[PDB]
C-alpha cells in the first residue's frame, strides 16, 4: 500500500514535508549535471504507474531544462524537449516515458524512464518486446510519448476534429481534389 | 399463454455448457461435412497421478468411506479439502 500512500503524498505538493524534500533536492540536482543518470527512481509510485520495472534494462535519467518562452510559445512541451535530450544522450535506448520531479524558478526537472531494447531480459519478456520492435525508434522525437499525444491533441470528440488522426493528414484529405472516372 | 407478458417466452426451446453447443436432395459437400461433424470421437479420459492415487488409498484405508472424517483429518489431508471434492476424487479413482 506504500505506493498509494506515496500517491497521496505526491498529490499534496506544498505540504511541509514535500516542500522541504523538494527544496533540498532541487539544490542537489542543480549542483549535479544538467543530464545525469538516476539509479533509484525519486518518485517510485509515479515510475511504477508510468511503466517502470526493477528489471535489468530499465534506467532513469533526470534532466533539467530552462523554462520560459521563445512572446512566442514553443508548440512542444518542456517535458518533450527534456525527453528528446535524454534520448539523444542515451541513443541506444528507447524513451518509455517521463515525469515531473521538481520545478525551481529557473529550470524544470524531469525523470525519464528508458528501456534497453537489445537486452536479453527485455527481449524475452513480452509487453516490452513491442518497444524492442523497430517501429518505435525515437518516439520522443516523433511525438509518440504521452507529452507528444497531449501536444498533438489525440483525443476523440467534436472539440478535436482537426487534430485526431493527424492534423496535416486531415488538412490534405480536406484539400485534395477527388476526380472519379465517371463524373 | 404469456402470463407475465415476457417476449422471450415464444423464443425458448443459470449455467450453460461453456466449451461446446448442444446442437440438434442436398449437396455432396454439405452431406460430407455434416457426417464429418457428426462422426463419433474418442474422449481420452484423464488419469490420476500415482501420488494422488496413493493419497486417496491411504484416506480410504484409514477411514473407509466416511468423507466427513476424511475431510476433517489433518494428518492425511494436509490441504484441507472438502468432503465433496474428496468424494468426487474417490469416484473418479473408482474405489467409491
Amino acid at each position: 500500500g506504500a505506493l498509494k500512500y506515496l500517491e497521496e503524498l505526491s498529490k499534496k505538493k506544498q505540504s511541509d514535508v514535500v516542500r522541504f524534500l523538494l527544496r533540498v533536492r532541487c539544490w542537489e540536482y542543480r549542483q549535479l549535471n544538467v543530464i545525469h543518470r538516476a539509479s533509484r527512481p525519486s518518485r517510485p509510485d509515479k515510475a511504477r504507474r508510468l511503466g517502470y520495472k526493477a528489471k535489468q534494462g530499465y534506467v532513469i535519467y533526470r534532466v533539467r531544462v530552462r523554462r520560459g518562452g521563445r512572446q512566442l510559445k514553443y508548440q512542444r512541451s518542456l517535458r518533450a524537449t527534456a525527453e528528446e535530450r535524454v534520448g539523444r544522450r542515451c541513443s541506444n535506448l528507447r524513451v518509455l516515458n517521463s515525469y515531473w520531479v521538481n520545478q525551481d524558478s529557473t529550470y524544470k526537472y524531469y525523470e525519464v524512464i528508458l528501456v534497453d531494447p537489445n537486452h536479453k531480459a527485455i527481449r524475452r519478456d513480452p509487453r516490452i518486446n513491442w518497444i524492442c520492435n523497430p517501429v518505435h525508434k525515437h518516439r520522443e522525437c516523433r511525438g509518440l510519448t504521452s507529452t507528444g499525444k497531449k501536444s498533438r491533441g489525440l483525443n476523440k470528440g467534436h472539440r478535436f476534429n482537426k487534430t485526431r488522426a493527424g492534423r496535416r493528414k486531415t488538412w490534405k484529405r480536406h484539400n485534395t481534389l477527388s476526380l472519379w472516372r465517371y463524373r | 399463454s404469456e402470463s407475465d407478458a415476457v417476449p422471450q417466452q415464444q423464443q425458448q426451446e443459470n449455467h450453460i455448457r461453456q466449451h461446446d453447443l448442444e446442437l440438434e436432395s442436398k449437396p455432396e459437400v454439405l452431406r460430407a461435412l455434416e457426417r464429418e461433424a457428426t462422426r463419433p470421437v474418442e474422449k481420452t479420459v484423464r488419469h490420476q497421478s500415482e501420488r494422488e492415487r496413493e493419497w486417496l488409498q491411504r484416506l480410504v484405508d484409514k477411514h473407509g468411506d466416511d468423507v466427513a472424517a476424511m475431510a476433517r483429518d489433518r494428518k492425511l489431508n494436509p490441504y484441507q479439502q472438502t468432503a465433496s471434492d474428496i468424494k468426487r476424487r474417490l469416484k473418479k479413482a473408482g474405489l467409491l
Binding site: P126, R127 | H19, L30, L33, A37
Partner: peptide, 21 residues
C-alpha cells in the same frame, strides 16, 4: 506469448464451423 493468453488460446481456440444455406 503471455501465459494468460496461452491459457485462453488453449481452452478457447478458433473452432471450425460451417453455416448452411
Amino acid at each position: 506469448v503471455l501465459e494468460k493468453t496461452k491459457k485462453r488460446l488453449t481452452h478457447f481456440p478458433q473452432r471450425k464451423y460451417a453455416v448452411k444455406a
